[PDB]
Amino acid sequence: DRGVSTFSPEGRLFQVEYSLEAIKLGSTAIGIATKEGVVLGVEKRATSPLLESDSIEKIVEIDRHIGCAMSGLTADARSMIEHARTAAVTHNLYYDEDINVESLTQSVCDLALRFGEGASGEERLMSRPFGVALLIAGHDADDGYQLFHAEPSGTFYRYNAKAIGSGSEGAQAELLNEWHSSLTLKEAELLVLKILKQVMEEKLDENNAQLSCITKQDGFKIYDNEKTAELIKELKEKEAAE
Amino acid sequence: GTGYDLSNSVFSPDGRNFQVEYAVKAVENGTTSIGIKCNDGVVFAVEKLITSKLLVPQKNVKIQVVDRHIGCVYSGLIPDGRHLVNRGREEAASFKKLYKTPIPIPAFADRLGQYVQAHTLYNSVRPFGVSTIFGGVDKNGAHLYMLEPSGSYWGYKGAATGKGRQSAKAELEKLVDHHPEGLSAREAVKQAAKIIYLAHEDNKEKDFELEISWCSLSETNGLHKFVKGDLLQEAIDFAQKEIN
Amino acid sequence: GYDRALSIFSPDGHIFQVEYALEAVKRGTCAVGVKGKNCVVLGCERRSTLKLQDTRITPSKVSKIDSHVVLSFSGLNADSRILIEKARVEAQSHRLTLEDPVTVEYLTRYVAGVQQRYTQSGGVRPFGVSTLIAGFDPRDDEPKLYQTEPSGIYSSWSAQTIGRNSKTVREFLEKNYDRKEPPATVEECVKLTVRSLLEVVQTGAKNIEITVVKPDSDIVALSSEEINQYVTQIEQEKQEQ
Amino acid sequence: QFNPYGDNGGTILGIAGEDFAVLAGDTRNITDYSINSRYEPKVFDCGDNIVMSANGFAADGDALVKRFKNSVKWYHFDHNDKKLSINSAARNIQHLLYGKRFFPYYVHTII
Amino acid sequence: RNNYDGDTVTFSPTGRLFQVEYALEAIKQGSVTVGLRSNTHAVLVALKRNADELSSYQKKIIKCDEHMGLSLAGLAPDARVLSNYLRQQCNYSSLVFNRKLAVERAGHLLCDKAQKNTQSYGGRPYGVGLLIIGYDKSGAHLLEFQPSGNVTELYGTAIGARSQGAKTYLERTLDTFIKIDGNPDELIKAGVEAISQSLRDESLTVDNLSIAIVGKDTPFTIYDGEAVAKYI
Amino acid sequence: AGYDRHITIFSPEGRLYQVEYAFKATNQTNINSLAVRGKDCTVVISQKKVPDKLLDPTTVSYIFCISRTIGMVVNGPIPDARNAALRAKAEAAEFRYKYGYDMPCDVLAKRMANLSQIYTQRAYMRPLGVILTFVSVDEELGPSIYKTDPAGYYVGYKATATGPKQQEITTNLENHFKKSKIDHINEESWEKVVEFAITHMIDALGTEFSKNDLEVGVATKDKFFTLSAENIEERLVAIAE
Amino acid sequence: GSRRYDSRTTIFSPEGRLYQVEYALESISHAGTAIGIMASDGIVLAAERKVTSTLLEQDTSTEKLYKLNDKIAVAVAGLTADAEILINTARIHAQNYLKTYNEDIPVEILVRRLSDIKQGYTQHGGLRPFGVSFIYAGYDDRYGYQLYTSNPSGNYTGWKAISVGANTSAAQTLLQMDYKDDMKVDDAIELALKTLSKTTDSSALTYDRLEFATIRKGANDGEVYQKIFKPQEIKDILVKTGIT
Amino acid sequence: MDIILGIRVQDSVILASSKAVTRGISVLKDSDDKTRQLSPHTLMSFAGEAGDTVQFAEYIQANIQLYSIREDYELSPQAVSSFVRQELAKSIRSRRPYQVNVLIGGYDKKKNKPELYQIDYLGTKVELPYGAHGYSGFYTFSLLDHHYRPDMTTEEGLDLLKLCVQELEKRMPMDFKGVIVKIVDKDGIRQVDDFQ
Amino acid sequence: MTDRYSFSLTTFSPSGKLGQIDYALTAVKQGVTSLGIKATNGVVIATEKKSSSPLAMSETLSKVSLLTPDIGAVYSGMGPDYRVLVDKSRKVAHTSYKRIYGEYPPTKLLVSEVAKIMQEATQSGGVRPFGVSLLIAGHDEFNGFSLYQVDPSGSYFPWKATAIGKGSVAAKTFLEKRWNDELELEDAIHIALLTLKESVEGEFNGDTIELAIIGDENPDLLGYTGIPTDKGPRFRKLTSQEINDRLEA
């Protein structure tokens, strides 16, 4: 038929475009960036009640000051995460310092579009684009706390808050209302919980959504169930009020 | 059946290779360009369509030199011309390295020909979207060559390709009859500038800039040089005179 | 150098070669595993296409990877062999370079990665296989069970099943596994496994295979008789109704 | 046999004051008993407030100074013009140098 | 319906290359950017487009050496590859020859780079448009790069969404912006004025405005945020 | 379906259509050539069609000097003719370097035949649309004519002809040898052999020629040369008794 | 480009089956029938030559029965040439094992290697599978007598009795009826011939259309003999059963 | 030189390995175990060039352990030793040969026989009642040639070894800090808890 | 350059046929008839030297080729595919046999080797099967005389006598009722001469017919003397005068 790297008549990459479709099919992940830090949440979305909910890992640590959230075909994200980890560490080996969040993200994105069937130059070795997207959260000393959306188009954008996956637009619209420049971190937490509860198929609880944050002080922590469960309760009471 | 025109290597049932012929269309859709073998050299000229006033004049050069003694001009897809000239350059360097002498014009044509021909052998490449007019001076005299996307080339008394080829062609035909002695290099220059103006009618809608070069034993010592300044102006003037 | 992209996206965002690989799994003989309080059992189903089959030399459905971890599959057979070799080698290499045997999760994550790579590489098709990987960590008493799909996704399971009519057995399982009271003995666990399998395979105690993993490399495959006694006991407990 | 190394003399010196730093070198370049030049400086400004001297075999010392200046520029490209910190510069030079662990730069480097 | 656009290796019976033409279209979708030059300077001005009011504006200006840089309209990762390859040839020029690379020369390099991707199977053409400015040994320079591999030197131009408004402006004020030598703050205002002929319909914020300047007394420098408030 | 038409695989009738369409191409130039053997010479006549008056007629040829001893005439489009020409020159010089003697006319035909055969069997090479007639006065064989085609065939001939009017020319010649009952032109001089060759070309195309309508190669013991129009003119006049 | 002509030989059908393997199995269904039966004191291999003329040579011919070891034979159903490529490979593997370990290769290990190769052709490299099924007969000291089957999918199984090629449903049903664990080699020989007698797509079973081999223990305990039957032997044993 | 000794008695194989590790002028360790277990019933002792010995040993262990799981079979001692012999014969002609000497001691559970194999760094393998690498033979072979009986108990074989180590401890310039003794029989592999 | 056909050009159809092999086989059927016969003390292979134009040269048309001084081959089908196959065949007899054991391969082994080359063309990426069938006749010391047929599939079989190409079915039937296992070489030549007659449409003489024998050792054809252990080639191509001479029967 046609190439895996061909243009549509509207000047779009078919395979890239079709990959964004697989992504909207994925579990929801949201990030909000405050000045006290950055928060990331994901909808675990378990297939069967026999599945161990702990074994679902959609928020991963890249370096001590960089966290990741994923949505899409999550098997595709394993090697991207590996390359991101290798990159932040290699950079530290070469320069005795933390890699900038921007630069790390730029390095992951380079990894995309590296697909095809013999594109004359070097080696575009990969049959298809990645079918997963990342929210890359981080801090550095030059640009403070930061949130990034990394698509399979090798493109990346900095958001102040951003949702991806099933009901991003739903979530995104809700974010566009609730986000202001002076959000506390504890606010941003409840906010992520709220917006997840709206768009999640199941009812929200510590067992089917997971929360994390990256703070300058402590770096990247993923919250435990007891910790998260308590923030669910915090919101339930908040929401029973005019 | 059909579909013989979809891959770059397929013979159609009348021994043809349609992808080469479609390439020829890319050529035909292009700017006019000509060559004139004078009596001790050659002259090259090409029509630079001025799309707008924003285009910086005198720049955006199109004629290219290969080594020091060969001029190349082409019509069609310009990046394809450039690619071809890069190859010509490595192929001329390679010749001079082994053999010391600058590459003789016919040998250089065969090098270009076998390369172009070679892109009509496989379906993993596309043919060349250009026709090239090239040549210059060696130890056997002046030589003018034209080369199509099929890899076909021959030696010409005069040559033309692009949108206005037939104006130029018929026009060039005149001089062949009228001067069996040949032209002055000096004469062929002005004579070339007229022909671009003539063959411009097929593109008369848009504005244009003329570009000439020449390679002549008495006039440039065997080296391909551009015509610029008070001789370019003189030949432009000579072209305006034969019109209105 | 065949590098044609066989696994690509289609406009709905599906990868059809990975999905057709799942179909190959549904076709394969059912497989199940359930986690005891201090064991894991693997139950599989014997093919009943033909007999005159030599039983002592036909490849069993459960494979030891290291001495403390087993893998069972569902789907293409020839495909599963390749996956098994790769992991057995990684089990050794991991021990050679880190002086520890693989954790069950590590090995799962390894196999998963291999499959994933085949969904994204020129000239190869994904694996027509889905796997259950079970055992105990080195120096650990807590049981481990993981499943793997042709897309390269893996996760942990209190109990789980794959292949033909796995959808049925999964239903039985979610209506029979109290996560707060796992079959706190080898017997209770081996029993619950047969109960699930048997209600899809039909009477054949020759159509069922069982393997039991206990802590510290205690791995034992049972003879039909041990299984036949397990069949017979629930025919009766049912025929008491 | 061919000897890929030579010695061009020179001495350099670097001192750290508590809010400043100096790096000095003579300007004579020699070979054996001959003076090649009375003025051929070997202490360089490489931007980002970093001065660097690679003294020993002059070809190697030149080559190394070129590579580092060029790695400052690429650092800038690759990290939105972040200033190269002196400690990062030093660690980067380690890697530059160690790249030729089995065909070394015949120089002693101070920044 | 048409069978001549599944790869870049196929001529239509008209003599066209649809895959190249499609990539051309990717550019026009990309947000507008404008280039112009006097004799002492060359300015890039680019309208970076966001996705959300929650998002950032895509950097459209890339620095290639100290005397050269470019603006991108189109598929971004392709401007990365292309610009990065330009940083390399600029570098090679300086390392091996101690010679700042001619702006013309970089233009030819881009053309030959892009051409290769339009004659060989399995490749795709570049889906990005680039405008390149620089000050070299022959003054200020502006270049327009197309993924077909067509590069032109021009006093001014624009590429992208509603590019034609700015481009028309430039065509008429040409006698006036080329004669503004030795005054860059005004060559910027003239550049910003041309880019306002392509707004439909938004106001230039500080967040979406991106100017780049390079000239006789100035190395390629990119102005963003507060630094551009001055021209609003 | 419709693909055994595009690449050199078999049709269900056992044919290679791509080869046939390549044979089709040999005639695209509308030129006729013929070759004939003297006692100690070998002649090739070919038509010379210059249509544009803007062309340099010295550069328009389909006769190639391959080595000092071997002449080659091509029927087909010039760029394939030149591709074959270069490869035969390369091959004939290599052969000399490796084996210490001049590459014989027939050996070179066989070698080019095998190269042609390769394109009929590999899908990525197209056949070349040419027929190659090789002539020489070989030191072991004598006057020699060997011909190759896009199928990969190679054959020696007493005499031969190629192009659109080839059957006319072949029948013409056949008749003469049938009459004379020898496999060659019993003539001591190559001039009178090229004259026979011209005559039988004129008497079968039903056209007359000037000096610029023809091309002539002669092969002698250790030399192959092409004639000037001025010498062609000389035989042309002599032809008109 | 060339992507068009690509049959895509290693893709899954929407039901998750492999076209070429499925189709290859079909090919094998048209091939001469071959049978393996394992007795308590041996293995029998019997096979029907698909083609025969009266001019064909009987003794000088092989198409069904091949030695791999001095301990392992195969019976072939399918593309003869595709089988020899796979046979030679297996023969080399067994020697590799012997050179490494100074022990003869256990039958299964040889069988697994060979199935793994077939398996590869169905997962990468864009090539057609081998159009071959193999019945394996052999002895090792870990499991004694063994009987294996392998097919184009790269799948293998162990058997007491098994058939490949044409009319396997008929043959399987027949062996299933008369097979007993306590069978001796003389019994299995007869059961094999008689199963072939009732599945032949041809009128009567003669010696010259049959190939025969047996793997025994013989007179000397410890050694195993491979007997590949001569035409006259096959003929004689045909007489000693209720045939001819 | 490092001490590598072995003797196979009636129904068991005994391996004795020196415990010293010396880097130039210091004895860095006195508690070194110069053996790897290959199978439950196969032990390999090794001595030679510093890095090569353990790298080789562990490489061989991995390969035997992988074979074992792949087949659920424990390869025979003769087979294990043919594998090792080929691995050294490959390396002797490689770019940097492993300079390692080995004894293989194993109980062939199939034949109920102890077997002992001696192989040097260059692939020379031989099967022996008793063997030693390096200088170790020069002191002890006159002792074994004398006292060795094919029908010795393990106790007798342990005594014969005790003699050998004494001869070594008195005539050898180097202090090898004693030996570790290991037995491979039908019940597998055990280390003599106290020797000398 | 850039050979991108790494995928196979012969696939299995759903019926289970290998199309390209069937088609190749078909191209053989339409080829000129050639035949072989095994006698007690020799082999003969024969074919028609069908001249296109009578301007073409008869000798130049070889269809009968020495492979080994004791092995000959002939074919039906696409002649260029054959010429190529002959040269691979001769080279392989040296490369995988003469240069290793110091003697020429036995006839069956050389055959299985040609078979190998052919099989690969039915499976390797980017190629079509060969459009030929060969009959190959030889004598080695341990198998004596033998005659094989090799097809584009890679399959081969030994024959007492056979034929391929156009008139194969008639020829095979005629051969079947004239072959006994007590023919001298000379008899089998005569029979081959008969069987060819039917298939040869037109002129039938020593210049339109090609014939080879794999027979006795010709120490007259050795080229050297002095090593009694080295006898002549057993292969001999008959002369037109030889054929014509016994055409009087």
GROMACS .gro file of C-alpha atoms in nm, chain A residues 91-100 102-103 142-143, chain D residues 71 75 78-80 82 84-85 87-89 91-92 95:
model
   28
   91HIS     CA    1   2.422   1.398   3.162
   92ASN     CA    2   2.509   1.393   3.530
   93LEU     CA    3   2.812   1.173   3.458
   94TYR     CA    4   2.937   1.423   3.194
   95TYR     CA    5   2.865   1.750   3.375
   96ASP     CA    6   2.831   1.680   3.745
   97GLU     CA    7   2.487   1.837   3.762
   98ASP     CA    8   2.116   1.766   3.711
   99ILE     CA    9   1.980   1.769   3.357
  100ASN     CA   10   1.729   2.043   3.281
  102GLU     CA   11   1.340   2.085   2.914
  103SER     CA   12   1.652   1.910   2.781
  142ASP     CA   13   1.685   2.775   3.589
  143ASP     CA   14   1.316   2.737   3.515
  798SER     CA   15   3.182   2.184   2.380
  802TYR     CA   16   2.631   2.292   2.571
  805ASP     CA   17   2.172   2.193   2.388
  806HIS     CA   18   2.059   2.356   2.712
  807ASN     CA   19   1.895   2.690   2.628
  809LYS     CA   20   2.273   2.775   3.035
  811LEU     CA   21   2.861   2.622   3.195
  812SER     CA   22   2.952   2.600   3.565
  814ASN     CA   23   3.269   2.221   3.804
  815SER     CA   24   3.072   2.105   3.500
  816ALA     CA   25   3.349   2.231   3.271
  818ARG     CA   26   3.396   1.711   3.463
  819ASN     CA   27   3.348   1.760   3.090
  822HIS     CA   28   3.572   1.302   2.958
   0.00000   0.00000   0.00000
